[PDB]
Amino acid sequence: LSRDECKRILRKLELEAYAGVISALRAQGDLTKEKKDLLGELSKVLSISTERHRAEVRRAVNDERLTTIAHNMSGPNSSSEWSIEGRRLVPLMPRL
Amino acid sequence: DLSRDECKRILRKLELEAYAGVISALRAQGDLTKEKKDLLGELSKVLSISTERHRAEVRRAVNDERLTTIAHNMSGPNSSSEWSIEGRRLVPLMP
C-alpha cells in the first residue's frame, strides 16, 4: 500500500469507528456524563472535530431505527440530551 | 415496527461492531499505548464487552495484513508488542 492509501484507509477507519460508537450509545439510551466523557476521549484519539462529532450525533438522533431501538430499550424520551448535544453551531458567514 | 427482542439483538450487534471498529482503527495507528488501553477498558464497560471478545478482536486486528501494513507505514516496524500481549489477556481490562 502507498503512503496516501494508508492515510486514506486509516482516516476512513477512524471516521467509521467514531460513527459506530455514536450509533451504539445512541441506541442504548440518552447521553450520560459517563458517555460524554468517553466520547471526548475517543474523539481525541481518533482526531474527530467537535463539528464532526455534532454531525454524527444529529444523524444518529435522526436515525429512525436507532430511535426505535432506544424507544424499546430505555423509553420514549431518551434522546433529550443527545438532541441538544448535537445542535449546530451559530452560522458564521460564507468563508470565515 | 420491530419487536423489543429484535431491538435487543440489533443493539448487541451495534455494540460489538462499535468495539471492533475502534480496535481496527487503533491498530492501524500503531502499537497500543497506555492511553489507548485505558480507552478500550472504558469502551468495553459501556459496550459490555467480555474479555474473550476483546481478545478475539485484538487477535484479529494484530493478525490482519492490511491493518498491520498501515501501522508500519504510520509508526514503524515494532507496532505489535503491546497488541500481542493484549491478545493473551485473561483478566478484566477494567476502565
Find chain B residues with C-beta within 8 A of A24's C-beta.
Answer: 11, 14-15, 17-18, 47
Q: How is domain B1-88 classified at the architecture level of CATH?
A: Orthogonal Bundle (1.10)
Q: At CA A48, angle to CA B47 and CA B9, rounded to 5?
A: 25
Query: How many Å apart are CA B89 and CA A21, to the nearest integer?
Result: 23
Q: Resolution to 1 decimal, in Å?
A: 2.0
Of B32, B79, B63, the residue nearest A45 (C-alpha) = B32
The answer to whether the beta carbons of residues A48 and A14 sit under 8 Å apart is yes
Q: Taking CB atoms and an 8 Å cut-off, how many pairs form between chains A and B? A: 93
SS3 letters for A39-85?
A: HHHHHHHCCCCHHHHHHHHHHHHHCHHHHHHHHHHHCCCCCHHHHHH
A1-87: CATH architecture: Orthogonal Bundle (1.10)
Tell me if B75 sits within 8 A of B29, measured CB to CB.
yes
Q: Which cell is A74 given?
A: 430505555
Q: Do A21 and B43 touch (CB under 8 A)?
A: yes
CA–CA–CA angle B54, A14, A62 (5° rounding): 100
**CA A31 to centroid of chain Cα atoms:** 11
B15 vs A contacts (CB less than 8 Å): 24, 28
H helix and E strand count, chain B: 5, 0
Q: Residue B91 gets which letter from DSSP?
A: S
Q: How much is the CA Rg of chain B, to the nearest whole Å? A: 14
Compute how many other C-beta atoms are within 10 angstroms of the C-beta atom of residue A20: 23
Distance, CA of A91 to CA of A74 (rounded, Å): 34
Instruction: Please give the full DSSP string across B48-84, using - where no structure is assigned.
Output: T--HHHHHHHHHHHHT-HHHHHHHHHHH-S---HHHH
Distance CA B18, CA B35 (A): 19
